[PDB]
Amino acid sequence: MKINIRDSTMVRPATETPITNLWNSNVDLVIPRFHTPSVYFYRPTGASNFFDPQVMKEALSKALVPFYPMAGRLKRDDDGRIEIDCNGAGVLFVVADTPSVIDDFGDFAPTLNLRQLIPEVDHSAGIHSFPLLVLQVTFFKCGGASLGVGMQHHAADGFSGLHFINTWSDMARGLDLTIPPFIDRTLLRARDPPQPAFHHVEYQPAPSMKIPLDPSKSGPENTTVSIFKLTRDQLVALKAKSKEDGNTVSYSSYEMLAGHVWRSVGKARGLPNDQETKLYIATDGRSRLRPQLPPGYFGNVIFTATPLAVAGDLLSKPTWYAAGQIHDFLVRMDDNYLRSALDYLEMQPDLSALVRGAHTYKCPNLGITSWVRLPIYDADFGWGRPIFMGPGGIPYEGLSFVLPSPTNDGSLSVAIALQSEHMKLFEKFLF
């Protein structure tokens, strides 16, 4: 899998954008320290026109006017707090070629030679050097191309990120902005003074293994990334179930699915009865914060639900028990709880310390991020919607994504990184 960079360009906003510093809220700070990798794959239309770099770059430049912070840089304020320096410095746009064909990627598992479709950032050099957004269009010998996205998560969550990407693809089709970015994270400013109302389990350290894992089995070595498809039908049966073993309470499709994955993972890993496993579920607070956020709110509004169970219970009890634990946390996360969370974060002396990076997600724990509602397939640059869109490679073991069907259809895909031996067993999944 060899990549030949053809051309590299620092694209700037088409016109003068505001020169300003953009404050980060507590949840723009407690985010991963890296560029979130995502990848789109497109079949060729057969037209010579296909993904014309000039069309792409002119559109990019246009989109970087309403979404100008995306073209800025990181800097710290006088208190060492990370903020966005909106200096319109720009976004990296790379074009590459490869002798490989798209079909080499087979099923499109986020293995991380898929990371080669995204330009790599050399982190430091400084905090202020590397651009917030990197982009690579890669032309395959088969005629198709990929779009690789690397987005510094301080700029935005996947929700605002997609807002920008889709807006970009729109402008490439001569269309204009639809919902303008609303740019002001101070709506998530903590209350003054901070008064937490809950004990927030989502910010407490993850359970470690009672018996220390074999390092020759648990490194990034011997960590495998795979994908699996549920049909629907299996998704129909999965949600029901639920009535299993006399149980009367009806849980939601996500809840039953996430519990099933969670449970399937524990079985695959052979967790002993007394072992605790913590599940990390990324939750969007746009819909829950009850003063109610503007459409096109530009930033991070991701909170975290973390149900916990002893494996003895999780794996021996029916799947609706796992779904129950999940539901029990998800339902507690109303505006009041979220506001409590912001105030809790406000009282911590260093938010960088609360950033999960697995350790957090390593065995015996797990993260399930669902993109099922994200408009991940709307990025049509003029040559059609992507045949696939997924995480640009899963770094940590124990991290997993739920992807919606490109065709649609009511099938889902689960993309997961597990220890290699554990991965073969993870087919408690279709079980």
Ligand SMILES: CC(C)(COP(=O)(O)OP(=O)(O)OC[C@H]1O[C@@H](n2cnc3c(N)ncnc32)[C@H](O)[C@@H]1OP(=O)(O)O)[C@@H](O)C(=O)NCCC(=O)NCCSC(=O)/C=C/c1ccc(O)cc1
């Ligand atoms: C997982 C949640 C918490 C719930 O999902 P669900 O259970 O499947 O929800 P459903 O779709 O089944 O049903 C939701 C509906 O339930 C309804 N509901 C409410 N309570 C009830 C009730 N008590 N009874 C029955 N119905 C009810 C409620 O109205 C709600 O409606 P609505 O919210 O308007 O769709 C979901 O809302 C959520 O918070 N998702 C988080 C978004 C997410 O997964 N993001 C992934 C980010 S990963 C990342 O780092 C991104 C990096 C990235 C960066 C840049 C990029 O370009 C790309 C990626």
